[PDB]
Amino acid sequence: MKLAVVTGQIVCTVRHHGLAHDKLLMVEMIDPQGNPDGQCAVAIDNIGAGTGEWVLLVSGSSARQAHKSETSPVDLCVIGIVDEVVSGGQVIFHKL
Amino acid sequence: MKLAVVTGQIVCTVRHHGLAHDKLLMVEMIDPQGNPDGQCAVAIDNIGAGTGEWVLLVSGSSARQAHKSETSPVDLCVIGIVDEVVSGGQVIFHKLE
Amino acid sequence: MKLAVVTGQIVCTVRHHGLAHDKLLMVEMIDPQGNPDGQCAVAIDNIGAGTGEWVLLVSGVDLCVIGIVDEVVSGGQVIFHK
Amino acid sequence: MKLAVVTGQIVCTVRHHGLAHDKLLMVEMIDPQGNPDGQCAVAIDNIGAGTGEWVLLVSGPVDLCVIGIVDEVVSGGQVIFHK
Amino acid sequence: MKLAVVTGQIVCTVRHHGLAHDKLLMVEMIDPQGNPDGQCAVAIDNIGAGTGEWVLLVSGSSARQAHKSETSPVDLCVIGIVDEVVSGGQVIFHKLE
Amino acid sequence: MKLAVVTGQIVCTVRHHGLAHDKLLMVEMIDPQGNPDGQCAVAIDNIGAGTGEWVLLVSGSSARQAHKSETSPVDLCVIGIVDEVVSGGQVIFHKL
Ligand SMILES: [Cl-]
């Protein structure tokens, strides 16, 4: 499980039917401190995260489960939006 | 998933039955700034992507599910053709140039 | 498995229902000598570890707390105690 | 999946009976530009590829398995391999 | 599998139920020449290894199977205590040395 | 799947009961191509390979299957002994 920032959005009209009508968001991995890994990816989204918001990503077979079921053709899925990250009385990230 | 550009194709007349008669695309990955990275591979495709087009790729067991089932001998599968990619408040790719 | 110190907490009220009734921790890994080793990470936590506590982590999403560490002894010497 | 050239054969008469009726190949991976890329490997083969032939390899009974023999490869407009 | 030296131990009174009451050893891996390499870890143990002793370690899903089943939350498990290691026609470790 | 050379033997009297009475061999992975390298490991063996002989190793869940079943507590198993390796028709390794 990893933290990531939603950097944007991808649009595929012709797509695999098992993606339903869920958003495909451009996500860029970060350290929990907030350090871009350069690592880019596209994550399916059914929670409803917007760009700039920090998200919690699950990959692999859990990414399938998290999206819907084992049938899902996904290897990367957003399972949470971050409200804040604290570090002993200090809020290093907060959602606005 | 990952973004790649269909750079070409592979033709295997003699092939594993679980590949069906689906297409075998040469794909090169794409980076945040919208550019072809170093990384390359071959991905199966029944959606019908063509060379030059950008595609969304799934890998590992998910690719097997995507293509057919765990019977499928694939580690990479195309799950969509990309119409446009908007990142950082800027359109970094669009079909219609 | 790996040792780590809980450096903080990640809050997610809006969350996947499968992840429900779990805590999300910010953790920093501990090197062979009992020192925090820079590389920070995110771990799932259903035991209930607070910041400052040491935790045992299994790698298999990925990081999960599988215990809170009362003490650690190395080559004869205690390198950590609650 | 990955492209590779069959560089040779590994012979094992004494073998696990589950592995029976398969061929063991020595393969070298092929980079984006159609050149052998140094990193050699071992692949299982139940199709039947000889040395010199190019093969398609899936990564996933152990790791590398030949899932086809390559008749030709075209990249950015240009044919980089033909049988 | 891998050879390691039990260098110490970890005590977790509050712990996941699927760890049972098994021991939690600090293990450092060993290299071909018979020496403690850099790599270290914590491994579960119901065989009963003691500090100083060399042990055979299994990792990943195999470790879960080794310890109990896929219910076990472990990525490392001891599967034996090493009496001796003979390599290159030379005894490179023995209990009684 | 990887090539390896059996460099020696390990002896564990007190051992996991799911190892039966099978040999535990010191194995050193073979570089590309012809000689060994740093990578060391211990592989379970039920084929019966001796020291110096080149072996075919399977790891992970297949290593479990190859040894006996999913029950097996092994992450590395020898599934073949090499008779020979031929490059471009040039026997680079042959068994004595
Ligand atoms: Cl392997």
Q: Where are the domains of chain D?
A: 1-83
CB contact under 8 A, C59 and E75: yes
Q: Which residues pair with D79 in a beta bridge?
A: D74
Q: Which of C8, C42, C44 sits opposite A86 (nearest CB)?
A: C8
Gap between the Cα atoms of C32 and E27, Å rounded: 10
CA atoms within 13 A on the CB side of E29: 18
For residue C67, give both structure tokens: 């215990």
SS (H, E, C) chain E: CEEEEEEEEEECCEECHHHCCCEEEEEEEECCCCCEEEEEEEEEECCCCCCCCEEEEEECHHHHHHHCCCCCCCCEEEEEECCEEEECCCEEEECCC
* Buried b or exposed e, range F14-38, using 16+ CB within 10 angstroms: ebbebbeebbbbbbbebeebeebee
Which one, of B93, F14, D81, lies nearest residue E55 by Cα? F14
Of C9, C18, C44, which has the smallest distance from its Cβ to A66's Cβ?
C18
What DSSP character marks residue C50? P
Sign of CA dihedral D16, D22, D27, D30: negative
- The CA distance from F79 to F43, in Å, is 10
Residue C53, CA atoms < 13 Å, CB-side half-sphere: 19
Contact (CB, 8 A) for C64 and C47: no
Best interface-test mutation with C: which of A86, A91, A92, A94 has the largest number of C CBs within 10 A?
A: A86
The backbone torsions φ and ψ at residue F72, rounded to the nearest 5 degrees and listed phi first, read -50, 130
**Plot region of E70 (φ>0 → left; ψ -120 to 50 → alpha; else → beta):** alpha
- Domain F1-96 class? mainly beta
Q: Would you say F62 and D18 are in contact if contact means Cβ atoms under 8 Å apart? A: no
**CA-based Rg of chain E, rounded to a whole angstrom?**
14
Q: How far apart are CA E46 and CA E22, in angstroms?
A: 5
To which H or E segment does residue A63 belong? helix A60-67
Site of tokens 């990230």 = A93
Is residue B47 within 8 A of residue A16, CB to CB? The reply is yes
- Structure tokens given for D76: 């950015």
Nearest-angstrom CA–CA distance, A26 and A5: 9
E strand segments, C1-82: 2-11, 23-30, 36-45, 54-59, 63-68, 71-73, 78-81
E-F CB pairs within 8 A amount to 100
Q: Which helix H or strand E contains A85, and what residues bound it?
A: strand A84-86
**Cβ atoms B2, A76 nearer than 8 A:** no
Contacts with E5 (C-beta within 8 Å, 6 or more apart), sequence order: E27, E28, E30, E36, E52, E53, E54, E55
Whole-angstrom Cα distance, residue D72 to residue B26? 12
Shortest alpha-carbon distance between residue F60 and chain D (Å): 8
Per the listing, tokens 């021991």 go with E23
A42 reaches B (C-beta below 8 A): yes
How many Cβ atoms from other residues are within 10 Å of residue B7's Cβ? 18
- Residues F77 and F63 sit within 8 Å (Cβ to Cβ): yes
Closest CB from D7, D12, D43 relative to F82: D12
List all chains that touch chain D, counting a touch as 3 or more CB pairs closer than 8 Å: B, F
Which E residues, 11 through 40, put their C-beta within 8 Å of a C-beta on chain F? 31-32
Summarize chain A as % helix, strand, coil (round to 5).
Answer: 10, 50, 40
Q: Residue D67 and residue B16: Cβ atoms within 8 Å? A: yes
Are B77 and B58 spatial neighbours (Cβ–Cβ below 8 Å)?
yes
Number of other CB atoms surrounding residue A51 within 10 Å: 16
Number of residues that make up chain C? 82
What is the 3 state secondary structure string of F15-70?
Answer: ECHHHCCCEEEEEEEECCCCCEEEEEEEEEECCCCCCCCEEEEEEHHHHHHHHCCC
The angle at the Cα of F91, spanning F89 to F95, to the nearest 5 degrees, equals 150
Does the CA dihedral E15-E19-E23-E26 come out positive or negative? negative
Nearest CA to B59 out of D60, A37, A69, A19 is that of D60
Phi, psi of C31 (to 5 degrees): -80, 170
The angle formed by the CA atoms of residues E15, E20 and E21, to the nearest 5 degrees, is: 85
Report d(CA B54, CA B3) in Å as an integer: 7
What is the C-alpha to C-alpha distance for residues E60 and E65, in angstroms, rounded to an integer?
9
Distance separating alpha carbons of residues F77 and F70, to the nearest angstrom: 13
What is the domain class of C1-82 according to CATH? mainly beta
Q: Tell me, what DSSP letter sits at residue B62?
A: H
The pair of structure tokens assigned to B21 is: 């008669």
CA neighbor of F29 nearest in space, from F49, F48, F54, F46: F54
Classify domain D1-83 by CATH architecture: Beta Barrel (2.40)
- B18 by DSSP, 3-state: which? helix
- Per DSSP, the three-state class of A9 is strand
Task: State this model's resolution in angstroms.
Answer: 2.7
Q: Which residues pair with D82 in a beta bridge?
A: D72
Domain covering B1-97, topology:
OB fold (Dihydrolipoamide Acetyltransferase, E2P) (2.40.50)
CB atoms within 10 A of CB A28: 18
The position carrying tokens 């209930």 is C48
Q: Report the C-alpha gap between F1 and A77 in whole angstroms.
A: 31
**Nearest chain A residue to C5, by CA:** A87
Which residues, in sequence order, are CB contacts of A1 under 8 Å at separation 6+? A56, A57, A58, C42, C43, C44, C61, C62, C63
Instruction: State yes or no: cis peptide before C33, omega within 30 of 0.
Output: no
Residue with tokens 């077979």: A61
What is the spatial distance between Cα E65 and Cα D82, in angstroms, rounded to a whole number? 47
Backbone φ and ψ for A7, nearest 5 degrees, come out as -90, -15
Q: Which residues pair with F41 in a beta bridge?
A: F27
DSSP B88: S
Nearest to F8 by CA among E89, A72, E53, B28: E89
Q: Could you tell me which residues come within 8 angstroms of residue E43 by beta carbon, excluding any fewer than 6 positions away?
A: C1, E4, E24, E25, E27, E55, E57, E63, E74, E76, E77, E78
- Give the span between the Cα atoms of A49 and A6, in whole angstroms: 8
Residues in chain D: 83
Which residues on adjacent β-strands are paired with residue E93? E85
Structure tokens at A65: 């489960």
Contact present, B19 and D68 (Cβ < 8 Å): yes
Task: Please say whether the dihedral angle defined by the alpha carbons of residues D39, D42, D46 and D48, taken in this order, is positive or negative.
Answer: positive
Measured at the CA of E65, the angle between CA E63 and CA E71, to 5 degrees, comes to: 100
Yes or no, beta carbons of C66 and E19 under 8 Å apart: yes
Tokens of F61: 């869940």
Sequence-distant (≥ 6) Cβ neighbours of residue F29 within 8 angstroms = F2, F3, F4, F36, F37, F39, F40, F41, F57
